[PDB]
Every structure is written in C-alpha cells, then in structure tokens.
Amino acid sequence: KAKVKATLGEFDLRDYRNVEVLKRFLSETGKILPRRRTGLSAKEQRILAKTIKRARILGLLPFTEKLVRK
Amino acid sequence: ARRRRAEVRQLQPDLVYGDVLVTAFINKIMRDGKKNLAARIFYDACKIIQEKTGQEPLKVFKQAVENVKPRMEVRSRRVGGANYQVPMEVSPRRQQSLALRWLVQAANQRPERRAAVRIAHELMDAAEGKGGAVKKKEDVERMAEANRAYAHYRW
Amino acid sequence: KRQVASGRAYIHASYNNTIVTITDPDGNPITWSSGGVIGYKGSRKGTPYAAQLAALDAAKKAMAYGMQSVDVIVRGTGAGREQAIRALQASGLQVKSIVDDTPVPHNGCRPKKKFRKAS
RNA sequence: UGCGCAGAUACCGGGAGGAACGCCGAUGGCGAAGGCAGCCACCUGGUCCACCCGUGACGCUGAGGCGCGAAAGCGUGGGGAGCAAACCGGAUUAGAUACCCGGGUAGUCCACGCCCUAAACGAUGCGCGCUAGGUCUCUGGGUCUCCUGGGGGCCGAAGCUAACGCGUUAAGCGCGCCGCCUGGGGAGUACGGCCGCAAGGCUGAAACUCAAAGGAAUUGACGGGGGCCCGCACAAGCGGUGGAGCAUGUGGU
Ligand SMILES: [Mg+2]
Ligand SMILES: [Mg+2]
Ligand SMILES: [Mg+2]
Ligand SMILES: [Mg+2]
C-alpha cells in the first residue's frame, strides 16, 4: 500500500496544530505510526513524534482509541 | 507403522449374501482359527431371524451394526501435569471395527446357552436399538461430551 | 423490571476465567455470568467451553429483559475470547459491533515478578 | 491459603494519591565513566562540520591530590500507589528452612548528608603517525550517480595470534607516558596503617601444603538441548505369563 508521505504534498511537520495532516500519521488505535509505514526519515520521524505529542496535550489528537471489530 | 500408512487388508466377499462386511463379522466370531464352525454359527443365526421376525437377516445385520457405531470418543492425552480424555470424531474404519467387535462381545455376554442364538438375539435387540452392545456405545458417546471441556486440544 | 431493547456486552477474558456482563446503553449492569456461575470450578473456568457457556447464559438472562441487540466490548486475552464472541453472535441476540478495549499502561506500576519473566 | 451477602468480582460516573512514562523506538542517539527516555520553559556542559580569519608549540601522558561513581546499604526529615528481602500463611516433597500460590515490613520515591563497591565488561589504559577494499547506518558539508568529514555495525588485504579471533572503531606495524602480572591452595584471609556512624572499603603477607592450577582447539561419550529418520519401541489389535495343579531350571535352606 502507501506510505503516509507518499500521500501528501508539502507540509510543515513542526506544525503541532494542523490536525488534518497530523491525524494521518496515527494508527486506528491513535498510536504514532512506525517509520516503515510513515515513509519518513529518521530525522523527520523524530521531529514529528514531538509535534504529535504537543497536539495530544492541546486536545487535538488522541493518546488512544479502541480497535474496531476484533 | 512408521514408514507407510498400511493397506486395509481386504476381505473375500461372503459366499452367501456376497458381502465383505459379513465375512468381517464371521472372522470376529472365529476362535482358534476354526473358520468353519465360525461360519455355521453366523448363518444358523440368520435362520433364527426368519423363525423370529418377518425381516431379511442381512437388513437386520446392517441396521444393527449401523446402530452400534460411535460418533465420538475420548482418545487419551498426556500433558506435563495431568491426564486428559480428549473427544475426537471416529474415522469410518474404526467405527466398522468397534461395532463388530462390540456385537460379538455383547453377544457372548448374553445368557442363552448356544452360539447361534446369542448372536441372533443381540443382532435383533440392537437393531431395535436396545443392545448391551448399544450400552457400550452410548457410554463412549457420553464419555466424550462429559469431557467436552477438554475437547479443544484434539491433536 | 424495565424492557431494554439494546446495549452493551462486556467480555473480560483472562487466562483463568472468562466473565461476561450485560448492560443498558449507559453501561449499567442488567445481568452477568462467569465460568464459576455455570458449574465449572477451578481450572476449567478458563476453557473455551466454560467461556461459551457463561456467555450464552448471560445473553439468555438479558433476553428475558427483551434485549434484542448489543455492542460487544472485549478486554483481555485468554482461551475463551473468540468463543464468547462466537457465542453472543450465535445466541440470536444481535451483535451490532465489536471492539477490543484492553487496558494497558503507558508504563505505569511495577508488575509482579511473575509478569516480568520478561525481566 | 485468601477475599466476598457489612454485597466482592465484572460495568458506568466522580474524587484522592504515588510511582513509571505506551506507540514513536532502531542494528538508533548523547555522555569520561556510572549512566541518560511523556511534553513545556528557564539555567548549563560536551561535541561535529564549513570558512581558512586570528595566536604561534601554547603540546602528549600523568605517581600522589581532588572530583564523579549503578545497585544494595547507613543517618535525619518527609512520602508511600504498585512491587518486595525478612517475616506470616497455603501448597509440593522422602524432607522443602526453596522453586509455585496468598499476604507483608525494611526498602524501592523526594530532601539533605554518608558509604565508594561491581561480570564498574569491549573482560581491550590515554594520545599521535603509518598500513587494500566491500556493505548497512546516525549526524554535517559539496559541484548531492556519488564525493568529503565525524560517529555506529558487519565482512574481511597485509600482518598478528596457542588457538578462537583481531583486522583504518587493531589484538597490525611503530614512538611516548601511566597502571598491572610472575604456578595453584592458604587468601583478598592475618597483622599493621588509613578512611567510614555502621556495614565495611583501600593497602595486603607468612607458615604450611600440591604437581599441578589454567587457556584454545580435537575426537568421542553424554544432555530432564535442537532437527530429521528407523525397529512389534509405543500406539491400534489378537492371544498369553502373573492366580491353580503338575513338569522342569534356579535362588535359599
Ligand atoms: Mg539507593
Ligand atoms: Mg534511608
Ligand atoms: Mg510471594
Ligand atoms: Mg572485599
């Protein structure tokens, strides 16, 4: 399938507000997706984990969700 | 039987009704290798299902057998801590044998003083569905089912 | 005693006992069952059969209140698990949705020495 | 054992409190070591690169000294959710002062002050110069197929090594400085000195005794190690011995 960067166009991944983008880097359990799936570089992947965690504290992205249909 | 899965030793058909399943039965009745007396007995027994019922012996035989085949049974299983009677289905060859084994045994347990009668009654009483064979059939089926809890190993 | 039309079945699986409880759409318990609550007692309450039985039995008690449909919520791993789900599904009592929801700390209290054999 | 009809378990709401931060997470990164993991801010250390601008050998090592030094431990004062030496019980066992289960104090956490040890491990002191490559990777820079640094891994030229291995992250070839060894047991014990509130730490022998103690590899044998095979080995069967009387052989008397 796709890497989550292969999807988007250009974006500021220091931007802890843009939930419309940042929301795509989470699993269905709202867990930060691994590099192998994000398609990101070690360095970007570092920066993102940060931005994602900042969003979570503002209330805009989730810490967790629950698996639907198991 | 490590190497091959063994050919099911085939049987000559019966020289009367022409059925493998009959000789099979005859063989079980046989004692010290005396097949003659063995055969006389089973036929003379089919005669006591004329004299007694309007039906054809073969049909009674078939239909009694079909009545003493188990569907389930507990095969034993060791695991490091206890012993587990695990219910699995019964492959049709085993059914065949248990039934025919059981009949003869059930039959030789009966009271009447003569080979061909014991065979006969049993055969009748079990095609009705009330054999002492059929006891040690519903027991096995029951013994599984009571151990239905452990029926999730079945290897 | 009210008629509820639909609500929640909560399955709590463990390696020692499966337990199932049924509630109204705000999570208030209507009825419930467990391995022990059927006959099994000691190490049999875990077996997927025990799970199935309990599960089915709880559903029957809820169907008394006329319960027709449920959202399932499953929690924990253990033998009875898919079997208690398979049960509710096949109890008539209609299965709207399923959802695992097992608790997990984001690294919380020190686990008992049995559970850090992964030391 | 325990807990539960003084209503537990499972479920929904609310609150209180302590400890640790899931996914990201790596074969990753930083640090001299010990060690460092949610997120934000402030205060602060080390390090790498590019430009080739400044000083002009200002360097290397480093006995002693000082400082840091996981865990456990100690003192005073807090705190205490989960876990847990000791301990109190349930089991298991020939016994079971254990492994398994239920509880549980010190302790684990915070403040300040002590202790100063470790498989404190890369079991490899620090620095510099020299000696093929290939491959993966972190972080820079350029003219960005790749090139040039700095770090992290594997493979391996030459060479080295008892071997196994090491092999531009040397265990190679060489210079400088430090620290350490000199058969095993007695023994990191004794005495002595120093340090510590203690526990104890550092330094550290002899008599006596042994012809060994060791390292790496080899062929076997073995494993309540792994993989794959076979045999009336087990399973599936059929008939038996074990019980009786007698025959025969043996034990013993
Ligand atoms: Mg401590
Ligand atoms: Mg203290
Ligand atoms: Mg304990
Ligand atoms: Mg010592």
Swiss-Prot record, chain A:
- Which GO molecular function terms does the record list? small ribosomal subunit rRNA binding; structural constituent of ribosome
Q: Which UniProt keywords apply?
A: Ribonucleoprotein, Ribosomal protein, RNA-binding, rRNA-binding
Identify one Gene Ontology CC term for this UniProt entry.
ribonucleoprotein complex
User: Is Protein biosynthesis found in the keyword set?
Assistant: no
Look up the domain of life of the source: Bacteria
Any one of the GO BP annotations: translation
Q: How does it assemble?
A: Part of the 30S ribosomal subunit. Forms a tight heterodimer with protein bS6, also interacts with protein uS11. Binds to the C-terminus of IF3 and to the central section of Era.
The protein's job, in short, is: Located on the back of the platform of the 30S subunit where it stabilizes the close packing of several RNA helices of the 16S rRNA. Forms part of the Shine-Dalgarno cleft in the 70S ribosome, where it probably interacts with the Shine-Dalgarno helix.
* Protein family membership: Belongs to the bacterial ribosomal protein bS18 family.
The protein depicted here goes by the name Small ribosomal subunit protein bS18
What organism is this sequence from? Thermus thermophilus (strain ATCC 27634 / DSM 579 / HB8)
Curated annotation (Swiss-Prot), chain B:
> Superkingdom of this entry's organism?
Bacteria
Q: List S-S links within the chain.
A: none
**Pfam families registered for this protein in UniProt:** Ribosomal_S7
Q: Name one GO molecular function term.
A: tRNA binding
Give me any GO biological process, just one. translation
Q: Name one GO cellular component term.
A: small ribosomal subunit
Q: Which NCBIfam families match?
A: rpsG_bact
For this entry, the protein name equals Small ribosomal subunit protein uS7
Q: Which organism is it from?
A: Thermus thermophilus (strain ATCC 27634 / DSM 579 / HB8)
Q: Which gene is the coding source of this polypeptide chain?
A: rpsG
Swiss-Prot record, chain C:
| Annotated signal sequence range | none
Q: Which domain of life is it from?
A: Bacteria
Q: Where is this region: Disordered?
A: 99-119
Give any single GO term for biological process. translation
Q: Where is the composition biased (Basic residues)?
A: 109-119
Task: Name the keywords, alphabetized.
Answer: Ribonucleoprotein, Ribosomal protein, RNA-binding, rRNA-binding
Gene Ontology CC, one term: ribonucleoprotein complex
Q: Name one GO molecular function term.
A: structural constituent of ribosome
Q: Which residues form a coiled coil?
A: none
Q: Report the protein's function.
A: Located on the upper part of the platform of the 30S subunit, where it bridges several disparate RNA helices of the 16S rRNA. Forms part of the Shine-Dalgarno cleft in the 70S ribosome, where it interacts both with the Shine-Dalgarno helix and mRNA.
Q: Which family does it belong to?
A: Belongs to the universal ribosomal protein uS11 family.
Subunit description: Part of the 30S ribosomal subunit. Interacts with proteins S7 and S18. Binds to the C-terminus of IF-3; however exactly how IF-3 interacts with the 30S subunit is unclear. May contact the C-terminus of Era.
Descriptive protein name:
Small ribosomal subunit protein uS11
Species in which this protein is naturally found? Thermus thermophilus (strain ATCC 27634 / DSM 579 / HB8)
Traced from the root, the source organism's taxonomic lineage reads: Bacteria, Thermotogati, Deinococcota, Deinococci, Thermales
What gene name does this entry carry? rpsK
